[PDB]
């Protein structure tokens, strides 16, 4: 996240960090949505993925910090692109659930749709400048803006895309490399999943793309329920 500051150590209990057994590099984030499920982006998947919950600093462990591996991964059945990245979302079932604690708590899915003008918060362990990756997650506020700002920048993201276009039109604040999968929080709810954006991050008139969670609410709840034939919104 560029243009922001260190997040408050207690404001992101639902935030999880994704890495692998092969490296300590955090390549994405995700959000805990209940004791045994994590919501993130499909492109964050790795064959040997590891998930850190209850973490702030990558090096200084919180007393209740936990490590988990998946017992299952779920993607949209029906997608336009062969790689499914037109519906960049995935659910990870934790091998063992976590116990809610001071630094570990679920975030709510959207209770209603939020659009243009809504102020939201982004957060992650992604790049904070063209040269630096942080050790603690950084946060900042952005706005959902008209989808038109994104359409010309990302040809692969149509006006009919189940995505939210968001950022600061002035430039300066934006998610960045390594922030994918993390939550776009609006009014205490997870309205988006960081997908992608422009290069470099934070440019004037170049908001980024976040998977619009509200649309997948039924799919998400059905997978959690145990359904395995349900499909994502068309």
């Amino acid at each position: 996240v560029v243009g922001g500051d260190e997040c408050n150590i207690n404001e992101h209990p639902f935030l999880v960090a994704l890495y692998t057994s092969a490296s300590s590099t955090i390549h994405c984030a995700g959000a805990l949505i209940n004791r045994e499920w994590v919501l993130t982006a499909a492109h964050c998947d790795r064959r040997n993925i590891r998930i850190k919950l209850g973490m702030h600093s990558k090096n200084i462990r919180n007393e209740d910090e936990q490590i988990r591996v998946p017992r299952g991964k779920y993607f949209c059945l029906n997608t336009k692109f062969p790689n499914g990245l037109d519906k960049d979302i995935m659910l990870i079932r934790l091998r063992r659930p976590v116990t809610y604690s001071t630094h570990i708590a679920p975030v709510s899915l959207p209770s209603r749709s939020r659009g243009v003008g809504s102020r939201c918060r982004i957060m992650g362990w992604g790049k904070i400048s063209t040269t630096t990756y942080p050790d603690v997650p950084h946060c900042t506020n952005i706005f959902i803006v008209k989808h038109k700002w994104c359409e010309p920048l990302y040809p692969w993201v149509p006006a009919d895309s189940r995505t939210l276009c968001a950022g600061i039109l002035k430039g300066g604040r934006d998610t960045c490399h390594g922030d994918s999968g993390g939550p776009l929080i609006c009014n205490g709810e997870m309205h988006g999943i960081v997908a992608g954006g422009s290069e470099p991050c934070g440019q004037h008139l170049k908001p980024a793309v976040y998977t619009k969670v509200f649309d997948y609410n039924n799919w998400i709840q059905s997978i959690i329920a145990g359904n395995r034939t349900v499909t994502c919104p068309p």
Binding site: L85, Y154, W156, G197
Partner: peptide
């Protein structure tokens, strides 16, 4: 999808 897009 452009190579610089996914974060």
């Amino acid at each position: 999808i452009a190579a610089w897009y996914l974060r």
